[PDB]
């Protein structure tokens, strides 16, 4: 009748989009990067070790100053770390002990956390009373908060278990724009340096591009075959990489609608839980589930450096904005800072 | 040493925070996480209300104090997600509490009864590698309703394995418990079970004994006694 015709038209449209993407694939990066010398092998040492958590942690986020950290654990405590002097700046009690994400504002005035409580609490670090208390409860989500990112002092994008993303306003306390279109459950978020647009990944192996101002999807990436729970923009902002559960990373291109290289090896079977980029973008860092962290070259797809740190799931890979340190937490309630 | 006054004061504040965190960890050493799982038709809400009476959206916790030890159950039934991305947060629980309705062996959409869905959920939750060191508690509510309902519906029409006392109101319950226990894999995990009604006084005492036995078995594994 009409539903079958619409479905077959959509399938044909997807097929012709794939054909157009294949048509413009003039040459990959393998045949054009043979003229440059590879980086080779690099070694990173654990310069700092932050051990003050009781339960397993799942989230971390660096600051603009590249010195303050925030980590969320299952003990119901949010504490601010010092990357230089190895001290706890704050200790925020949590009304809910089940949180899976945390966000640090670029200005450092506010910190947000979320998880199984379906409430994205906002804590005001710069409180006139000294103690850090909650400021606004971003309630109204039917799923578990998976990721949280700050793009402004009054705007925050939060993913949840309802297979959608929402843009919230702390002052009003209500969501502004809802990003619908994700068939799978979104798990990770990444904000572009221009802040105008952001990309998200879900359980349907699809990376959907979204715009903060527009509020509706513009670009769709389908290169993986398993659940995707890690994403990070390129420093240039024209590309991004996703970390899925089948031990693979693809450098998807915004202007090409296709992946560049596959960052995988036959010696890894576990999944990926967190991916991040360096300041230059030449070095790609991925957090695997093999009790180890691996480093991939964005232009040669080689395992240029292995980070033998913790002994449990990492889930807390991050890089400073100025590319000075690489903090790497894990379920063992430990934060290792690499350089 | 070389630290300044601001550095010394910040270090002192960090040490105070560490002391507070250590005290909180010591306090939390006397509380155990009990993952509560069940369908919406299993009477979870009235179950928690009855437990609260006997004692005296986002998830919710119910702390109870008995003999100076704290028990809390997390109600994750409101989560509609795939459950395969946040179930690892409950890896370090002591026991898993299951509530299965005794009057749902005939109620069904996809030509499947609720008992089949409960069995599938139990099978897919026991096999999870996260719950390898946690015991299982299988509560069975609406016991009185089963006695009256068994006179109308029969388990033979749905499960072709119930042979014997077809109309007894005492053998079908043992049979469903037995087949539920049969879902245990080769890894021998203790599955505690109780036959609770709408109004009872042993509802909290059974779970107290079950968590006590679970902690005893965990200590036996820790103490090299099996």
């Amino acid at each position, epitope marked *: 009748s009409e539903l079958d015709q619409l479905r077959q038209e959509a399938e044909q449209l997807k097929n012709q989009i794939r054909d157009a993407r294949k048509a413009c694939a003039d040459a990959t990066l393998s045949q054009i990067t043979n003229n440059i010398d590879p980086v080779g092998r690099i070694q990173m040492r654990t310069r700092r070790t932050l051990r003050g958590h009781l339960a397993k942690i799942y989230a971390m986020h660096w600051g603009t100053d590249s010195r303050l950290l925030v980590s969320a654990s299952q003990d119901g405590k949010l504490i601010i770390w010092d990357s230089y002097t190895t001290n706890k700046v704050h200790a925020i009690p949590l009304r809910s002990s089940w949180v899976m994400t945390c966000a640090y504002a670029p200005s450092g005035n506010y910190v947000a956390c979320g998880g199984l409580d379906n409430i994205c609490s906002i804590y005001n670090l710069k409180t*006139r009373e000294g103690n850090v208390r909650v400021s606004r409860e971003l309630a109204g989500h039917t799923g578990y908060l998976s990721c949280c990112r700050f793009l402004d002092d009054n705007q925050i994008v939060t993913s949840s278990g309802d297979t959608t993303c929402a843009l919230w306003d702390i002052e009003t306390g209500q969501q502004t724009t809802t990003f619908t279109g994700h068939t799978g459950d979104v798990m990770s978020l990444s904000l572009a340096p221009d802040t105008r647009l952001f990309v998200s990944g879900a359980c349907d192996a699809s990376a959907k591009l979204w715009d903060v101002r527009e509020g509706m999807c513009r670009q769709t990436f389908t290169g993986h075959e398993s659940d995707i729970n890690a994403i990070c923009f390129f420093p240039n902002g024209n590309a991004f990489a996703t970390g899925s559960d089948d031990a693979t990373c693809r450098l998807f291109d915004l202007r090409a609608d296709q992946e560049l290289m596959t960052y995988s090896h036959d010696n890894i079977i576990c999944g990926i839980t967190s991916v991040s980029f360096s300041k230059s973008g030449r070095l790609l860092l991925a957090g695997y589930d093999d009790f180890n962290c691996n480093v991939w070259d964005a232009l040669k797809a080689d395992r240029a450096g292995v980070l033998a740190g913790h002994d449990n799931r990492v889930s807390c890979l991050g890089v400073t904005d100025d590319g000075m340190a690489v903090a790497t937490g894990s379920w063992d309630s430990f934060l290792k800072i690499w350089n | 040493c070389t630290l300044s*006054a601001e550095d010394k004061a910040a270090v002192e504040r960090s040490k105070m925070i560490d002391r507070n965190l250590r005290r909180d960890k010591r306090d939390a050493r006397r509380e155990l996480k009990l993952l509560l799982l069940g369908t919406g038709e299993s009477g979870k809400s009235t179950f928690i209300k009855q437990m609260r009476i006997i004692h005296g959206t986002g998830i919710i916790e119910y702390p109870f104090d008995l003999e100076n030890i704290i028990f809390r159950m997390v109600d994750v039934g409101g989560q509609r997600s795939e459950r395969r991305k946040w179930i690892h947060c409950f890896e370090n629980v002591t026991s898993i509490m299951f509530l299965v309705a005794l009057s749902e062996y005939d109620q069904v959409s996809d030509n499947e009864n609720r008992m089949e869905e409960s069995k599938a959920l139990f099978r897919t939750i026991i096999t999870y590698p996260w719950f390898q060191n946690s015991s299982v508690i299988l509560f069975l509510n609406k016991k009185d309703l089963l006695e009256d309902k068994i006179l109308y519906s029969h388990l033979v029409d749905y499960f072709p394995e119930f042979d014997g006392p077809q109309r007894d109101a005492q053998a079908a319950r043992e049979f469903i418990l037995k087949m539920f226990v049969d879902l245990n894999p080769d890894s021998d995990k203790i599955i505690y079970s109780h036959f609770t009604c709408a109004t009872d006084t042993e509802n909290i005492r059974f779970v107290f004994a079950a968590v006590k036995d679970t902690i005893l078995q965990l200590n036996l594994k820790e103490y090299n006694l099996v």
Partner: single-chain antibody, 234 residues
Framework: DVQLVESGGGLVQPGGSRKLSCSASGFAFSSFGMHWVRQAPEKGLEWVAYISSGSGTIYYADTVKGRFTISRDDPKNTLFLQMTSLRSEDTAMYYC??????????????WGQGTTLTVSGGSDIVMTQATSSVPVTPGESVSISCRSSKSLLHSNGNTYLYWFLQRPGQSPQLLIYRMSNLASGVPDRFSGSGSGTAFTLTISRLEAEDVGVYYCMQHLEYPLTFGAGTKLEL
């Protein structure tokens, strides 16, 4: 709001003992390092005693070392101050001052109202304030210079220089809490600068509210010493 009101004040014969207590409300008293600064009638502010959070670190100035003791009652939410023997040099108006220390924190946020009572210097850093009164016109540019015995630039990379302004008839407030950053509740017309020793404070578009007495504080060395006191008069 943060409120710090003092009590236990009044005239007393020299050689006696007086109990001074300030009530804390509107803020976390258990997480703030309380101080004690007195305003001498013929001088400026000067630190007396300090207590950390939870009575952890208790330090005293060399002038009032041993003679003055400080104790806080966290459950009672009240800071106490006991003095063994009083003298003419201790006749001043003490300030119950709160302070919290961490990365990016602003020490000496709120100053107590204070109470008045009457009777009837080694290895320290001194602030050299050559000027005492700077007559200026409203809306003009005002520059105030300060200096210390030794450079305040530590290995971390920032100098520990504090600026204060005491309005006539009320407690002072914090203006600058580091080398070149602004505190909370302070208009953005202030802009500190320097090169390690030549501390300066640039003020643009000065209003009639800036007639208070300025103060210069160092914090690289723990003993807190205020400046001479630059009283701006229109």
């Amino acid at each position: 709001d943060v409120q710090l009101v003092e009590s236990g004040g009044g005239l007393v014969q020299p050689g006696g003992s007086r109990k001074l207590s300030c009530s804390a409300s509107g803020f976390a008293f258990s997480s703030f390092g309380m101080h004690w600064v007195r305003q001498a009638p013929e001088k400026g502010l000067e630190w007396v005693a300090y207590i950390s959070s939870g009575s952890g670190t208790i330090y005293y100035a060399d002038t009032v070392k041993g003679r003055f003791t400080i104790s806080r009652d966290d459950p009672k939410n009240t800071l106490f101050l006991q003095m063994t023997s009083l003298r003419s040099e201790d006749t001043a108006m003490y300030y119950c001052v709160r302070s919290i220390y961490y990365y990016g924190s602003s020490p000496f946020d709120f100053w107590g109202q204070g109470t008045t009572l009457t009777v009837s210097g080694g290895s320290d850093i001194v602030m050299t304030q050559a000027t005492s009164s700077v007559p200026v016109t409203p809306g003009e540019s005002v520059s105030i210079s300060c200096r210390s015995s030794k450079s305040l630039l530590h290995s971390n990379g920032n100098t520990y220089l504090y600026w204060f302004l005491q309005r006539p008839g009320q407690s002072p407030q914090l203006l600058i809490y580091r080398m070149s950053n602004l505190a909370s509740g302070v208009p953005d017309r202030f802009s500190g600068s320097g090169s390690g020793t030549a501390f300066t404070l640039t003020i643009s578009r000065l209003e009639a509210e800036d007639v208070g007495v300025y103060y210069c504080m160092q914090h690289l060395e723990y003993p807190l010493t205020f400046g001479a006191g630059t009283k701006l008069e229109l």
